[PDB]
């Protein structure tokens, strides 16, 4: 039973109401409480900040907020939370051995391939399509003219020959008779082979769109190293990652792109990434990979940086340091922690992550099915057209 | 491991739903179409022509005589060449030798039960370390099974595992990662693509109540935060096989040979069926 | 003042492609070649064996049909007459299409035996880093 704020929205009356809490930190705490004889009382934070050394407006005094703000003020004395270990926080309060080793990672949108009806006709331009459609007819017609005016293949047969040459069908029966036409037919066949080879060469890329920009490469991504106004990426305000990005000497510039878009909580940033509002989200690897496994449209990139661990924060002068350290390490050595990972973080609803090329599905070539349906419905009308023609 | 290719790998380019929709429903619709268009040439000849046209191999067929049927065949052949180009565009990448891990993890039944196999699985660790302590306090029986496969050192274990003397080597993660990176030919790989059980770290030992603990902790945290650990590990702990044109065998083409074998079986069954039908 | 700005770099010998007489046969293993060759003949024989004993396609016609559909040549204009023979022949043609597509997908790759083994990625490359 955890007593916490009801409304997380800023500028709202925050009254401590008791909700019910349960998770990796909660049952880790109950493990500590069973191994070590003590009583606990879990309550939420006054705000949604992990903790950041901040200047106060009056007298320019340093203070901590969130977990360590409550802890240094005596309101709380031990923390079970995904609290990253870093230099700044270790100076004032002490951390036990990590209970989850993880780094930093970027979460982005999966960007499922855009499927369109006219995907298959993309390789050739519309002008080129029209020109080749005219070319097949014109080659048919001067083949007909050459064979008709030979010194020593009707119109319909000429068209059938040309069409069966352009596309491999075998419909065209009867080679040209005159020697003049028998070379032009051969060169037209060569042209048709060139056309079909060119179409086959790169229609796969146009059928399923690639990911030129989605393929993020750690923090070395060009649109991450040099932030523009089109690519917007941010993180949780007042957390470990903010301190980390403030500390590096080379990344300071993108930190200036970083400060104006920081979100209040991780869930809000994840939701913003989900609805294509935030292009990329910088966060610890564990939460991001869990979200990517659970939220099927979100994807991680890799290239872990700033490897660290989640630790149990506690006061600098407390007797539980050694006891909690040995208890957490004993939980490491035995089967407890990987069981907890299996039960709470290690479960997938979708993965769809592999180095193999994507598997073609309905939407990938819905266009060709629509094309053959249109061919059927066109034939069912041209039949009445040709019956009327035979009537005449 | 040598690895293998699944027999269903060459069906993987297109989903089974696409296969059944095109090759049963769409194909029969087009065939019965062309037949009734010719009527205005048995339906068997029609489906034969459609089947031969789907994958053009100069298969002898009898082309339809009607103009509208010829248009139907031309548009179907355009569809078929699109299908062939799409199928063969990524066929090489789909038919790729994939490497399957023989052990799923430290809790695999091969480790749990090594006796119930035709070969005695040969796997052990270097003694006098934390690995043997963890194995003992977690799994005593498998430790007393370890005892007869103990290795003198890491290099001895590596040279034994390169040959057939050993099958698996269990030890702390960093050393194995470094060895796999620096391995020649990349013939040695950790299971699970980096499966870690103890997920512990390396620390600096100190005397009880040493006054240097605080300064050392602050120094290590400062080094971690400033990113020095990154270039220190990529200068020493970096590997070669990290971040890194094959012939085709019967196993790669096992699926298509199974398909043709099933075709021969069903042709024999149809032969028997038609003999009883005519009888 | 310098009269030519430059820097240290690596010179290597270009491994010129030496094409063997069997390079185009590299994509398919010799055992696969023998197996598919035997398969061609066994399919060719079974087609006319099934066709001749049909109450409802001779040696030469059947073997020419099989070889032509395997090679996509159209040498023999002889189709089987019995139904199960039709299914067997169409599956045989499909297998021929699959195998020729697989051969095409890697023929040019094995036709030129060039690999970036001799390519050097500066001084950070391993083979120079590791003696």
Numbering used by the authors:
A (entry chain C): 435 to 586, 601 to 840
B (entry chain B): 540 to 579, 599 to 802, 808 to 842
C (entry chain A): 531 to 586, 601 to 675
Quoted passage from the original study:
Their activation results in excitatory currents that underlie synaptic plasticity, cognitive integration, and memory formation. By comparison with previously determined structures and together with our results from kinetic modeling of fully liganded receptors, we propose that the gating reaction of GluN1/GluN2A NMDARs involves at a minimum these three conformations, referred to here as: primed (closed-pore, all M3 helices straight), engaged (closed-pore, only GluN2 M3 helices bent), and open (open-pore, all four M3 helices bent).
Capture of the GluN1/GluN2A receptor in a fully open conformation required addition of a PAM, despite the Po of this receptor being near to unity in the absence of PAMs. Presumably, the reduced likelihood of receptors being open in nanodiscs or detergent micelles is a consequence of the absence of a bona fide membrane bilayer.
